[PDB]
Amino acid sequence: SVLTQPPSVSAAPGQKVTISCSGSSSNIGNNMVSWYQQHPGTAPKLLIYENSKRPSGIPDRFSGSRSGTSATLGIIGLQTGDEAEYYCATWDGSLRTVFGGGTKLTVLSQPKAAPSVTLFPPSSEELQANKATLVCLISDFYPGAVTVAWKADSSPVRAGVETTTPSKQSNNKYAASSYLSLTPEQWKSHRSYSCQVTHEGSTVEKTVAPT
């Protein structure tokens, strides 16, 4: 996308954090940035406008700044209520308003935990229906944010990938799943496929083969 943000940031309550918004001369370089806070299920809420101005009602522990072709959202004195998705936005020369992909802010309430990954190949039954689905189940991770990448042999693959949003488990950690839809020929024409889950900079991957 035109504007780029890290997918996730986290800190303990009472701590402070910053969220980057990477743009270019076509947007941030010529126009002012606005920021939003969104709690899933409800509409985004304006937090900052004109790079650093705070609308009435927004506490001063939220701040914004812009430098060159990048912008920054700062949050001091983290509270559990601050957990939400944060977005930056501005006008781009392509003639439209653009939003960054969003940053999930987690207020650490338990130790970080790497995801457990289980990958299943297409079933013989599905293959007889002339279909093929690779199922990658991801669980027990915290914070609740991951990035999934699929490999056909050693090559990246984006087409046919559907990944769910992480959901809180009964044990308060998170779960998610990613599905890769393939034709039976694609499945059989590669030596293997891999589901790689990146969490907190560490990647846990699993591989399955048609043989």
Partner 1 sequence: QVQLQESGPGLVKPSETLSLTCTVSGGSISGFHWSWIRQPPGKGLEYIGYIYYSGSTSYNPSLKSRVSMSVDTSRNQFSLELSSVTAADTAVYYCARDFGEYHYDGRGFQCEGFDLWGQGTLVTVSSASTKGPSVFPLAPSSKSTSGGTAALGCLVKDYFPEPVTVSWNSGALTSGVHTFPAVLQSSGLYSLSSVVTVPSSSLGTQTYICNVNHKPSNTKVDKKVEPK
Partner 2 sequence: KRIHIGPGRAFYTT
Q: Is there binding between residue 99 and partner 2 (CB under 8 A)?
A: no
- From residue 199, alpha-carbon distances to 25, 117, 123, 204, 205 in Å are 31, 11, 28, 8, 11
Tokens of 103: 């940053």
Among positions 58-87, residues that touch partner 2 (CB under 8 A) are: none
The contacts of residue 207 (CB under 8 Å, 6+ apart) are 119, 192, 193, 194, 195
Among positions 32-51, residues that touch partner 2 (CB under 8 A) are: 32, 46, 49-50
Residue 164 touches which member of partner 2, partner 1, none, C-beta under 5-8 Å by kind = partner 1
Q: Is there binding between residue 177 and partner 1 (CB under 8 A)?
A: yes
- Judging by beta carbons within 10 Å of its beta carbon (0-12, 13-18, 19+), is residue 76 exposed, middle or buried? middle
Shortest Å distance, C-beta 91 to partner 2 = 12
Q: What does the alpha-carbon distance between residue 170 and residue 191 come to, in Å, rounded to a whole number? A: 37
Q: Are 148 and 158 in contact (CB under 8 A)?
A: no
Among positions 82-141, residues that touch partner 1 (CB under 8 A) are: 87, 89-91, 94-99, 101-102, 118, 120, 123-126, 129, 133, 135, 137, 139
Shortest Å distance, C-beta 14 to partner 1 = 30
Piece of 10-18, 74-82, 165-173, 196-204 that binds partner 1 (CB under 8 A): 165-173
Nearer to partner 2, 54 or 104 (CB): 54
Nearer to partner 2, 26 or 163 (CB): 26
CA atoms within a 13 Å half-sphere pointing along the CA-CB vector of 180: 27
Q: Which residues bind partner 2 (CB under 8 A)?
A: 32, 46, 49-50, 53, 55
